[PDB]
């Protein structure tokens, strides 16, 4: 089935630059019309740029907040779809979707349509300077129990921009986790994520977060004691 | 440009209700009007294109009707998995506008918070900070209460309060507080508590641990 996965988003300051780029597979590439559509925090969607196939010359279309200063382009022999972001703004700051145009309008209509989106990557535009987060476990203080469940976390505090990634056991403990949304403070974001586990197999069985922060290259793991 | 409204941003609905999301162009868009849902998660997919069509793969509860301006989705037979943000498209003309979104929360029955308390950490004390934590957990209705108790004195201060998006399981929410104090500030109590309220209960629910015990 189709993939599109982003990469490329990251920090970047009032009137500079950033690429991002998009790997495509699972389809025909060169067939098909691509899209970069993005959504900034907490906003709506907005259509951002166009590119079509080889067969249509590779017309390019942009959306007038964009025109003039990004660039839409392919690599066909690739599968893969770039975006040249250039005199980048605040109001750019987005989560930012590689997308495949609907297929053969004789079939799907002449009205365009967003037929497969990938997960996004994360553009923000910031004065602000990359800092890592400080991570804290979590741990119930001594001489009280619950006989069913105990519940754990890390904390995550201080760190810009997003975002971050926390998980349990590498992973493996993925149906009892609560990630708590971050929350900007003086500049600076905070955030949480809890796990419950059985009480049997906790102490006796180790429990440990993993804390990404690819913005500051960070990844911290904070095993929990008792 | 074409604006594209959806006049309801947010809606709550039962399990097995019927749900309509109205869309509504400035100007005549010719049936190429389109439907997203994005999970809770980010991810997006399309429902229905050219008013009607439903993709195919997507469930046939979901429905489409309309022309000329206005339009709608319509949701039969809600399930759980709906939890979703919904957008019209239109793709008619250049640039291709989105509306606003319409965010549907699913309701269930009420459930009370599970509630957990957590002093600081050894490595934050030794930097000189304390953030004691309180987690309220899988409760329903959303609106929720919090307060800090330090030595049986509320302290608002310093708190700051972080709600889960709703579970895409069973539909309940979950809310963090964090209160942030200077380790000279912690030292100074001893007990410390974060109360719940919530209408569930006619009593608070209560976590406490005491400093020097700990």
């Known amino acids: 089935e189709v993939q599109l996965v982003e990469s490329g988003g990251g920090l970047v300051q009032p009137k500079g630059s950033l690429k991002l780029s998009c790997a495509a597979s699972g389809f025909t590439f060169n067939t098909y019309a691509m899209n970069w559509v993005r959504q900034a925090p907490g906003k709506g969607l907005e259509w951002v740029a166009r590119i079509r196939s080889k067969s249509n010359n590779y017309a390019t279309y942009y959306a007038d907040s964009v025109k003039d200063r990004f660039t839409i382009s392919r690599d066909d022999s690739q599968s893969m779809l770039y975006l040249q972001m250039n005199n980048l703004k605040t109001e750019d700051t987005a989560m930012y979707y590689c997308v495949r145009h609907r297929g053969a309008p004789l079939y799907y209509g002449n009205g365009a349509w967003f037929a497969y989106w990938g997960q996004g990557t994360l553009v923000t535009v910031s004065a602000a300077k990359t800092t890592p987060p400080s991570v804290y476990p979590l741990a119930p203080g001594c001489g009280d129990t619950t006989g069913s469940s105990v519940t754990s976390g890390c904390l995550v505090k201080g760190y810009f921009p997003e975002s971050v990634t926390v998980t349990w056991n590498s992973g493996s403990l993925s149906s009892s986790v609560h990630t708590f949304p971050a929350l900007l403070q003086s500049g600076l974001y905070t955030m949480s994520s809890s796990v419950t586990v059985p009480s049997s197999t906790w102490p006796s069985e180790t429990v440990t977060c993993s804390v990404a922060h690819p913005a500051s290259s960070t990844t911290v793991d904070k095993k929990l004691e008792p | 440009d074409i604006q594209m409204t959806q006049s309801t941003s947010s809606l709550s609905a039962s399990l097995g209700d019927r749900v309509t999301i109205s869309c509504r162009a400035s100007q005549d868009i010719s049936n190429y009007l389109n439907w997203y849902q994005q999970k809770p998660d980010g991810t997006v997919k399309v429902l229905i294109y050219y008013t009607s069509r439903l993709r195919s793969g997507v469930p046939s509860r979901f429905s489409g009707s309309g022309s000329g301006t206005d339009y709608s989705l319509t949701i039969s037979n809600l399930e759980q998995e709906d939890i979703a943000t919904y957008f019209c498209?239109?793709?008619?003309?250049?640039?291709?506008?989105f509306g606003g979104g319409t965010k549907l929360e699913i309701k269930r029955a009420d459930a009370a918070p599970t509630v957990s308390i957590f002093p600081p950490s050894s490595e934050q004390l030794t930097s000189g900070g304390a953030s004691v934590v309180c987690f309220l957990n899988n409760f329903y209705p959303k609106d929720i209460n919090v307060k800090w108790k330090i030595d049986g004195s509320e302290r608002q201060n310093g708190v700051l309060n972080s709600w889960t998006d709703q579970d895409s399981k069973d539909s309940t929410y979950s809310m963090s507080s964090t209160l942030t104090l200077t380790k000279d500030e912690y030292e100074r109590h001893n007990s410390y508590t974060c109360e719940a309220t919530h209408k569930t209960s006619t009593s608070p629910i209560v976590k406490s641990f005491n400093r020097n015990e700990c």
């Open positions: 498209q239109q793709g008619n003309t250049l640039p291709w506008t």
